[PDB]
Design a protein around this ligand. Structure first.
Ligand SMILES: [Cl-]
Ligand SMILES: [Cl-]
Ligand SMILES: [K+]
Ligand SMILES: [Mg+2]
Ligand SMILES: [Mg+2]
Ligand SMILES: [Mg+2]
Ligand SMILES: [Mg+2]
Ligand SMILES: [Mg+2]
Ligand SMILES: [Mg+2]
Ligand SMILES: [Mg+2]
Ligand SMILES: [Mg+2]
Ligand SMILES: [Mg+2]
Ligand SMILES: [Mg+2]
Ligand SMILES: [Mg+2]
Ligand SMILES: [Mg+2]
Ligand SMILES: [Mg+2]
Ligand SMILES: [Mg+2]
Ligand SMILES: [Mg+2]
Ligand SMILES: [Mg+2]
Ligand SMILES: [Mg+2]
Ligand SMILES: [Mg+2]
Ligand SMILES: [Mg+2]
Ligand SMILES: [Mg+2]
Ligand SMILES: [Mg+2]
Ligand SMILES: [Mg+2]
Ligand SMILES: [Mg+2]
Ligand code: NA
Ligand code: NA
Ligand code: NA
Ligand code: NA
Ligand code: NA
Ligand code: NA
Ligand code: NA
Ligand code: NA
Ligand code: NA
Ligand code: NA
Ligand code: NA
Ligand code: NA
Ligand code: NA
Ligand code: NA
Ligand code: NA
Ligand code: NA
Ligand code: NA
Ligand code: NA
Ligand code: NA
Ligand SMILES: [Sr+2]
Ligand SMILES: [Sr+2]
Ligand SMILES: [Sr+2]
Ligand SMILES: [Sr+2]
Ligand SMILES: [Sr+2]
Ligand SMILES: [Sr+2]
Ligand SMILES: [Sr+2]
Ligand SMILES: [Sr+2]
Ligand SMILES: [Sr+2]
Ligand SMILES: [Sr+2]
Ligand SMILES: [Sr+2]
Ligand SMILES: [Sr+2]
Ligand SMILES: [Sr+2]
Ligand SMILES: [Sr+2]
Ligand SMILES: [Sr+2]
Ligand SMILES: [Sr+2]
Ligand SMILES: [Sr+2]
Ligand SMILES: [Sr+2]
Ligand SMILES: [Sr+2]
Ligand SMILES: [Sr+2]
Ligand SMILES: [Sr+2]
Ligand SMILES: [Sr+2]
Ligand SMILES: [Sr+2]
Ligand SMILES: [Sr+2]
Ligand SMILES: [Sr+2]
Ligand SMILES: [Sr+2]
Ligand SMILES: [Sr+2]
Ligand SMILES: [Sr+2]
Ligand SMILES: [Sr+2]
Ligand SMILES: [Sr+2]
Ligand SMILES: [Sr+2]
Ligand SMILES: [Sr+2]
Ligand SMILES: [Sr+2]
Ligand SMILES: [Sr+2]
Ligand SMILES: [Sr+2]
Ligand SMILES: [Sr+2]
Ligand SMILES: [Sr+2]
Lengths: 132, 337, 53
RNA sequence: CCAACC
RNA sequence: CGAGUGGCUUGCUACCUCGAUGUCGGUUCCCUCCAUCCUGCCCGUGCAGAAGCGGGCAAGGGUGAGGUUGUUCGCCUAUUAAAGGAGGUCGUGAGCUGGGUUUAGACCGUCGUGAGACAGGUCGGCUGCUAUCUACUGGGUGUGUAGGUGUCUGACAAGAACGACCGUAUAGUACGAGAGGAACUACGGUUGGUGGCCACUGGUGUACCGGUUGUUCGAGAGAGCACGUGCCGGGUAGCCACGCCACACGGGGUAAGAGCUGAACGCAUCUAAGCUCGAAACCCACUUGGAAAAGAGACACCGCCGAGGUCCCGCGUACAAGACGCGGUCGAUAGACUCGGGGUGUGCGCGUCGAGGUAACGAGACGUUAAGCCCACGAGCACUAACAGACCAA
RNA sequence: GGUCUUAAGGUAGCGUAGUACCUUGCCGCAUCAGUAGCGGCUUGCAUGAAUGGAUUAACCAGAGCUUCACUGUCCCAACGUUGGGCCCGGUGAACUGUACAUUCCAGUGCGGAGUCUGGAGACACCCAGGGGGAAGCGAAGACCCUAUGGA
RNA sequence: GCGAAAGCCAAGGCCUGUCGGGAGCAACCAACGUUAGGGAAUUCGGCAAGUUAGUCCCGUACCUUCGGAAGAAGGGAUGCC
RNA sequence: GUGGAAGUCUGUUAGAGUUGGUGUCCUACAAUACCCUCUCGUGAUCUAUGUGUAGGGGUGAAAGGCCCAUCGAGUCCGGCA
């Protein structure tokens, strides 16, 4: 993928429960897999800011629950490092549901997004209210 | 079905024993291209700080932008190429033929060697030139030593001696180039060899940790879950199969870890100066203050503070040189805190 | 930059930026400041702080 | 599979 | 239908072992095989492209995470370049586990007149040992080569030190009616592996500073105990990873394969002689060890009445003993002191205020006070201690 | 089959059960995915009425399953504490010992060799270590069979 | 303090749950403290560890042999002067 | 409201016991020990001393448990070489 523009310490693993920062009807997401990732023996697959992940809906509307969908990690509590050395961290972990073209399934995003995620997923960005 | 997994640790840095010379010894030198020139230099590790640089990379989306970069400060005072040793080619490889020494010696070089009192620089030179005419001359190197005294933070006064190959144009031309340096006093500096922005390979004896177990030394797992409470916590599963009936040297075991020679490749030289611009408030921890010839190496360098590190022009650079990077800031913030 | 908590200047190539839930931003110069803020202390009531001084 | 008797 | 190879399954045999070679599965750690799952290079196609399908060379590297089940196997899920198979006493219990299996208790079904039986099911149910030899990982002392210091050589030895992927430009281009849709090459990044380092972020930090509960020292001050910090907050050095740095290109020879010249066989023929090319594979490049390489090495200088070394002393860039390294007045090596740089968070005492209360009394607030306390770091400084001194040595 | 053996021929209930071989039975629930678990169906290899059937509030260091909370069980390990470990003074055992013994790769051999054969490697001694091998030490195999053995 | 509970302290007893000396004191082991983000992914199985916790006020379901279930659950309060 | 029942609850009160760690130990401190966790604790309770039941016999809320480290038939000596 296109260089992110910052160094990330993956703060999530397969099975982690995160916030769905959009209005798709899904409230809580569970990480199932990380696109393009391949680990090592015993290592739990990890995901962090900027990664595209497959997810299942743990909490939300009946129609959304249990659906297996693609998403994009927009926020995480574990810090990340920007070119100027500063570390950046969020209040929670969150992802935005996305389709085969990486366009947000929802109409609006909730909460701030990291600028680095904007680079990668422009259409996701062209839905962001706040970009930090 | 027993998943695959790479082995624990590399088999290419063994045996993992205590190094014989604390002074690093390069086992390779740059190729002969440009004009003749000493292919290496040395210094003493002081500590680290960071510097904000202007992205130099012409292929970077950030070219021309601020960038914080970690730097290891190495005090690189002038050294003295004290002699010229010649190697001849023989059926059994290269062998020292003779050496051309000088008269001017640093006041304390006698803390390591028995300084020459009676030598014939011309008989030596003569034998060497005859070797070239004959075509039996191997490479040409300079016996070099440091000047610990120039460095206040380092307690040693006893100079460290190392041999550094001289490469360059034609042998005749660099042979003459070698003889010139030596004769003077051999006093040469970091500037004479490197330019800020070039890539250097740094060699040094790592920090010692004495005896350590397989977990730390080879990176084997610790025992897990229930297997961690029965009486074994940091011991590997087994020393090998029933057959072969012996323990292979490849199984991870306890032993000396640290204090090994390592040659770190492609370290970019961020800046070569003199003075106290890089020094840190309060002084570099366990080292002291810097105020003299110094080099800022990008990133980390093997060894503890005060150890002798060696520089060599990168023998296998991956990227082209981008000379004299622009340094907009050099942190001097205390390292205690 | 200045630390949004104690007031001292943040040494370049240092510190962390915490991104609040509402999108706000707080630039901390160190863990000490972060940790006092986490405790709910207001920099103005802490004597050693530049803000307080 | 299997680690005895069936 | 015919001919074989393997020794993973199963069967057969009873050769070895019953004065015992602990039994399945898993786990951990190491080496290997190729009948190749991916990656490199090829050939064919019912090969336009993209992609499939089949075949050849090839074992360098990789082959992962999860749900049921003790399970092996397998079924299933999302990832992936791919998530290959097999040998090592079905590698691995003087390594682990004890779910299964596999005693003694007990139950169900079936069988038995009964005692009791059932690779049928079910609940519970015990794992000893201070390593002699050998093996290997690391560390020493001697002898040999035959006075000392310093610097090297390189026979050998180890490496995967690197493997893989995504993205961009090429390019909505070649190809194709369209749908769809490449490559050479140049770049940016990720992942797995590898070695090192602590400026940054993060952890620790029973150094340290603060808050505070119970109790005891009459109160105050200052302290002990509450497990080797009572509890809580912060955290220097150091050590660490979750942090940071670095880990090619290029040559040489080949396999499959593509060809050249070319005859036996006037022609033809990549082959028989000769030759041009051509794989992640082989060799070199790179890193690490390496004078005990018995052909036991090379060079330079010093010394044989003295070069050098030992004891001793102050110490760590070193360290389980040993070893290693630095300094010893020609000196800043360690400590004291004073600065500097750090940690904590505003000391004792006193003064004002303070809900009230006749008063006594009074939790607490402000000032004095960027205070007080403390520091495994740095500088300065010979104040103290590196003194005195003994000895070996061609 | 629409009686026959041997008296009767399984009723109420319960049911894939701590009983179902087939079997991961089929449907549903729950999970990304559930040989598990729960509900239903049920022809029950081989349920069933004091050989008690069903049911059941309360109780339980009894067996199985799910959820919330939490966490170093795990990803993936780090730093620290106390006692050992290491060095020194003193005290001072035991297990084990046919012999030799510096081994390694192959082979051979009663087919599972440090000692046989061929090669390879190998200067002596000592310290620390984790235990690959000595089919290691400990116990005349608790299994199996055999004995004109025992209980 | 509810307390013959914990913890601390008297009277009284002891330094004999009887080998010491030394190394910032390494590997490894026994007990144990602290661990960012994730939060059972570990495992046959949450085994081990942890979470909760005292007292008062509010409030408390299915089911029931009417006893119980129940401290269900869930929520709030707590010092000093 | 009183009353204060209970093979009733909590409880390391005394006291009794022992689910798990398959922790420590396993030439032990110990031929059944140590630590934490855990269960009972007004009763078919626990406990001291005295006393009775004896080997094909006792005793047994039954595990072939127990009858002096010994039990699907104690121990000693004898039968017995
Ligand atoms: Cl995955
Ligand atoms: Cl393990
Ligand atoms: K046997
Ligand atoms: Mg695993
Ligand atoms: Mg620091
Ligand atoms: Mg800082
Ligand atoms: Mg036989
Ligand atoms: Mg045995
Ligand atoms: Mg093949
Ligand atoms: Mg291989
Ligand atoms: Mg086996
Ligand atoms: Mg074994
Ligand atoms: Mg065993
Ligand atoms: Mg043992
Ligand atoms: Mg079971
Ligand atoms: Mg069982
Ligand atoms: Mg059986
Ligand atoms: Mg069922
Ligand atoms: Mg009846
Ligand atoms: Mg026997
Ligand atoms: Mg039997
Ligand atoms: Mg009989
Ligand atoms: Mg943590
Ligand atoms: Mg698992
Ligand atoms: Mg438990
Ligand atoms: Mg009695
Ligand atoms: Na143990
Ligand atoms: Na074995
Ligand atoms: Na065959
Ligand atoms: Na096994
Ligand atoms: Na391969
Ligand atoms: Na499975
Ligand atoms: Na075996
Ligand atoms: Na065992
Ligand atoms: Na096993
Ligand atoms: Na080649
Ligand atoms: Na019946
Ligand atoms: Na009970
Ligand atoms: Na822990
Ligand atoms: Na062994
Ligand atoms: Na019997
Ligand atoms: Na004594
Ligand atoms: Na009444
Ligand atoms: Na117990
Ligand atoms: Na009898
Ligand atoms: Sr050298
Ligand atoms: Sr070399
Ligand atoms: Sr155990
Ligand atoms: Sr063997
Ligand atoms: Sr035997
Ligand atoms: Sr082959
Ligand atoms: Sr392929
Ligand atoms: Sr199966
Ligand atoms: Sr098997
Ligand atoms: Sr295996
Ligand atoms: Sr079992
Ligand atoms: Sr079974
Ligand atoms: Sr049975
Ligand atoms: Sr000899
Ligand atoms: Sr492209
Ligand atoms: Sr199109
Ligand atoms: Sr204490
Ligand atoms: Sr508490
Ligand atoms: Sr060919
Ligand atoms: Sr020699
Ligand atoms: Sr019926
Ligand atoms: Sr032999
Ligand atoms: Sr040992
Ligand atoms: Sr007293
Ligand atoms: Sr005594
Ligand atoms: Sr702490
Ligand atoms: Sr689980
Ligand atoms: Sr699981
Ligand atoms: Sr509550
Ligand atoms: Sr009771
Ligand atoms: Sr009780
Ligand atoms: Sr047990
Ligand atoms: Sr425990
Ligand atoms: Sr025992
Ligand atoms: Sr009572
Ligand atoms: Sr007895
Ligand atoms: Sr007799």
């Amino acid at each position: 993928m296109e260089a992110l523009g910052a160094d990330v310490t993956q703060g999530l693993e397969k099975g982690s429960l995160i916030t769905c920062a959009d209005n798709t009807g899904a409230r809580e997401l569970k990480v199932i897999s990380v696109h393009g990732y391949s680990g090592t023996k015993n290592r739990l697959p990890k995901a962090g800011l900027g990664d595209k992940i497959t997810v299942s809906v743990t909490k939300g509307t009946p129609e959304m629950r249990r659906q297996v969908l693609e998403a994009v990690v927009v926020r995480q509590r574990k810090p990340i490092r920007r070119p100027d050395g500063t570390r950046v961290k969020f209040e929670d972990n969150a992802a935005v549901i996305v389709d085969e073209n990486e366009d947000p399934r929802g109409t609006e995003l909730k909460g701030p997004i990291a600028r680095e995620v904007a680079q990668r997923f422009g259409s996701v960005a062209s839905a962001a209210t706040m970009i930090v | 079905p027993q998943p695959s997994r790479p082995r624990k640790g590399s088999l290419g840095f063994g045996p993992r024993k205590r190094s014989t010379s604390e002074t690093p010894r390069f086992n390779s030198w740059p190729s002969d291209d440009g004009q003749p020139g000493v292919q290496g230099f040395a210094g003493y590790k002081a500590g680290m700080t960071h510097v904000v640089l202007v992205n130099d990379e012409p292929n970077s989306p950030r070219e021309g932008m601020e960038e914080t970069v970690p730097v290891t400060v190495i005090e690189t005072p002038p050294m003295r190429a004290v002699a010229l040793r010649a190697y001849e080619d023989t059926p059994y490889g290269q062998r020292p033929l003779t050496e051309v020494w000088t008269d001017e010696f640093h006041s304390e070089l006698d803390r390591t060697l028995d300084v020459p009192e009676d030598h014939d620089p011309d008989a030596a030179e003569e034998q060497i030139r005859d070797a070239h005419e004959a075509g039996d001359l191997g490479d040409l190197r300079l016996i070099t030593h440091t000047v610990p005294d120039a460095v206040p933070s380092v307690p040693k006064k006893k100079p460290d001696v190392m041999e550094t190959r001289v490469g360059g144009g034609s042998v005749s031309d660099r042979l003459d180039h070698a003889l010139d340096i030596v004769e003077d006093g051999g006093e040469h500096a970091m500037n004479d060899i490197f330019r800020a922005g070039e890539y250097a390979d740094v060699a040094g004896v790592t920090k010692g940790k004495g005896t350590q177990g397989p977990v730390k030394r080879w990176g084997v797992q610790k025992r897990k879950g229930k297997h961690a409470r029965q009486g074994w916590r940091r011991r590997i599963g087994n020393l090998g199969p029933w057959n072969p009936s012996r323990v292979r040297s490849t199984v991870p075991q306890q032993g000396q870890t640290g204090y090994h020679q390592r040659t770190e490749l492609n370290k970019r030289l961020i800046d070569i100066g003199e003075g106290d611009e890089p020094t840190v408030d309060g002084g570099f921890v366990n080292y002291g203050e810097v105020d003299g010839p110094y080099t800022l190496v990008k990133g980390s360098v093997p060894g503890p503070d005060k150890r002798l590190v060696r520089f060599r022009p990168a023998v296998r650079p991956n990227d082209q040189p981008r000379l004299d990077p622009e340094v907009r800031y050099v942190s001097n913030e205390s390292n205690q805190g | 930059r200045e630390c949004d908590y104690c007031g001292t200047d943040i040494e370049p190539g240092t510190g962390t930026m915490f991104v609040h839930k509402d999108g706000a931003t707080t630039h901390f110069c160190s863990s000490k400041c972060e940790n006092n803020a986490d405790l709910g202390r207001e920099a103005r009531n802490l004597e050693w702080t530049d803000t307080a001084r």
